[PDB]
């Protein structure tokens, strides 16, 4: 039986932006979690609803792998019941999450001396995101009274802002790569169990 492709998730060359996060469904495979047990001691591993030591004897219908790049001090927001601009207008996790979250610093890969302007987040949004909702949309945000008619200016703002990663920043403003494994369980043949 095929193995679960956990290597192609953590070891990919490019990660997405947080406002346009990536998703990968994993099904019909044997899940060897030793990959997570052998992780180097600079990763950040947490689990919710299930003990890490007992992933090798549970069965799930689906596993979701969500990957993105955030700032150093915003990894605290990738958790159930959190508030802030990343948790509100970029990426939201339910209250009863039931899954694991892994994060690691990627300064050697995503920083540039001239500044990396390819990583962006959403700064202006009128209301919070529902859990696992993605908002890829570039429309002028009116913070004023008169309509904007799709033109920048006073009270008319481009919604997205840029990280601009540089090697000389403090560790809390350095890039971090984040993977979220969501364990799904419904009334189904339970494809992803794995010895």
């Amino acid at each position: 039986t095929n193995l679960c492709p956990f290597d192609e998730v953590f070891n990919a060359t490019r990660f997405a932006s947080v406002y346009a996060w990536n998703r990968k469904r994993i099904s019909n495979c044997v899940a060897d979690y030793s990959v997570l047990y052998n992780l180097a001691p600079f990763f950040t591993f947490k689990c919710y609803g299930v003990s890490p030591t007992k992933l090798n004897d549970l069965c799930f219908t689906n596993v979701y792998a969500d990957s993105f790049v955030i700032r150093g001090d915003e990894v605290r927001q990738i958790a159930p019941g959190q508030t802030g601009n990343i948790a509100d207008y970029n990426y939201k996790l339910p209250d009863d999450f039931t899954g694991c979250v892994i994060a690691w610093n990627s300064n050697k890969l995503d920083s540039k001396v001239s500044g990396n302007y390819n990583y962006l987040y959403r700064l202006f949004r009128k209301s919070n995101l529902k859990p696992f909702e993605r908002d890829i949309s570039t429309e002028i945000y009116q913070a004023g009274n008169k309509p904007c008619n799709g033109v920048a200016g006073f009270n008319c703002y481009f919604p997205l802002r840029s990280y601009s990663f540089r090697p000389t920043y403090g560790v809390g403003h350095q890039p971090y790569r984040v993977v979220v494994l969501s364990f799904e369980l419904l009334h189904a043949p339970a494809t992803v169990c794995g010895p």
Partner: antibody
Amino acid sequence: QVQLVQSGAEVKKPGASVKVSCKASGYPFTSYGISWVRQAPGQGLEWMGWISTYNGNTNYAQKFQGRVTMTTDTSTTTGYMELRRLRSDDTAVYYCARDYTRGAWFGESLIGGFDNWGQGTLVTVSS
Amino acid sequence: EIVLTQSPGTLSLSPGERATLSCRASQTVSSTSLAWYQQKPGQAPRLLIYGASSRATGIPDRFSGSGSGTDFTLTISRLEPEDFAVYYCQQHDTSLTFGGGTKVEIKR
């Protein structure tokens, strides 16, 4: 104990077709892709293409864009590279390698390279 | 796509000096997608460095890599007799291409 045994030497001629084989052994076959490489006598390496052993997606070089076909067999864990329209400058040693530059499942670019190689298979083409 | 000029063309050294090989790219190449290979005479190649810094499985410590952007360097510290081979660089940033190769010879 990863090992890739490969076919024997071929002595083909102009216009013909050749099919080299590459038997994988010692690892989960469906988890990695296969890359084929070529080296002319007294020259440098030059890429040929990539194949996903899981869902069959292939990615060929522009130079060979259509002259070549790659296949896989999951039961015996075997890869096949077949070349056609053999000219006289296609004399080279052809190599089979296990790939870590492109995922088998999602087909994205990985941090790595060609980690395990074959033994080579000389293919002389001459009139 | 990217063309990698690899310098110098040849290199004759003595068994114990420090060797420095250069790979230069026309375009800008990310550091996550450049690798080095070593081929001994009569054998198949073997991966040495991936990601421009990381060392492959079973490779001794005297090999290392550095550089960024458009210029990358492979550094060998001790030249044992087996380390006299032909060394190649590739990238897979935008399609996969190899370098020209740089022979490493013995000075006498």
